[PDB]
């Protein structure tokens, strides 16, 4: 049941992907550590909530 993931490697040793292994020990997922494999979304719903789509090269008001 082991989960194997990649490390985003920063300062590489003077020594190909490097990995780390994870195993969950508990039945309750609340007991689990934080994966940190998170996603990103686009700010649109906050930055552009206007009904008509905006073209930046065009006049905002027309």
């Amino acid at each position: 049941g082991a989960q194997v993931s990649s490390q985003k490697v920063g300062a590489h040793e003077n020594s190909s992907t490097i990995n780390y292994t994870t195993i969950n020990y508990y039945r309750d997922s609340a007991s689990n550590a934080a994966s940190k494999q998170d996603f990103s979304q686009d700010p649109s719903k906050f930055t552009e909530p206007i009904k008509d789509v905006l073209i930046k090269t065009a006049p905002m008001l027309n």
Partner: peptide
């Protein structure tokens, strides 16, 4: 066995 990713 063990599921990689």
């Amino acid at each position: 066995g063990s599921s990689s990713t």
